[PDB]
């Protein structure tokens, strides 16, 4: 699915494919606890995205 | 002659943190920081001292016999 925007707000998941990244320059988020690679679907697809800035393990999508 | 270090703080803080890291170990030979560029248009008295970048080493174009080894 084409993604021109992605964001998430106040999501608690699990370390492994957690994402919870806000692509907007306001309230930037990262991902810790190791390294994971999921080029097809990281967690839910959809609002998972990258856009401008690189954050951790989000690169494969 | 420009104060633009205050305009773009990426250049200023890099130089400010550079002065603190060079002074961390003054007795140790395991801390060495060098640099290379095209020329020196600006002299900084703070960077000129024992334990920092001081001596100017110019690198002119290779000589006649020097090019024989590179072509070899």
């Amino acid at each position: 699915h084409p993604l021109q925007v992605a964001r998430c707000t106040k999501i608690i998941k699990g370390e492994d494919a957690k994402y919870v990244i806000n692509l907007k320059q306001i309230a930037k988020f990262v991902v810790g606890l190791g390294e994971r690679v999921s080029p097809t679907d990281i967690e839910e697809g959809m609002r998972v995205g990258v856009d401008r800035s690189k954050y951790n393990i989000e690169l494969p999508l | 002659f420009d104060s633009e270090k205050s305009g773009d703080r990426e250049v200023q803080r890099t130089m400010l943190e550079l002065l603190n890291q060079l002074d961390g170990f003054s007795s140790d030979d395991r801390v060495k920081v060098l640099a290379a560029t095209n020329r020196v248009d600006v002299l900084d008295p703070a960077l000129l001292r024992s334990g920092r970048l001081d001596r100017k080493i110019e690198f002119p174009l290779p000589s006649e016999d020097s090019r024989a080894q590179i072509l070899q």
């Binding site: 707000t9 106040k10 309230a27 990262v30 991902v31 810790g32 690189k54 954050y55 951790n56 | 060079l22 003054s26 007795s27 140790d28 030979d29 395991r30 801390v31 060495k32 920081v33 060098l34 640099a35 024992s50 334990g51 920092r52 970048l53 001081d54 001596r55 080493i57 110019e58 690198f59 290779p62 000589s63 016999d65 020097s66 090019r67 024989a68 080894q69 590179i70």
Partner: protein, 72 residues
């Protein structure tokens, strides 16, 4: 530094993962090169041995004299 999204309150620090490390930085452990590959610089190479290489070998000889070896 872990903080709240709403109240913006500091909770707990986080380990280093994405530091904005400025990638494409060349890291090479003990490369392979000799001063004989590029000739004609022996005038500058001697200056690189005197002010860098030789004080880098042993720092205890210069410490007994009370002076400080140049770091670059």
């Amino acid at each position: 530094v872990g903080v709240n999204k709403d109240s913006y309150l500091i909770l707990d620090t986080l380990p280093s993962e994405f530091d904005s490390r400025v990638k494409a930085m060349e890291v090479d452990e003990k490369p392979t090169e000799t001063y004989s590959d590029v000739g004609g610089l022996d005038k500058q190479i001697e200056e690189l041995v005197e002010a860098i290489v030789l004080p880098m070998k042993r720092a205890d000889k210069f410490k007994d004299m009370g002076i400080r070896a140049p770091k670059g």
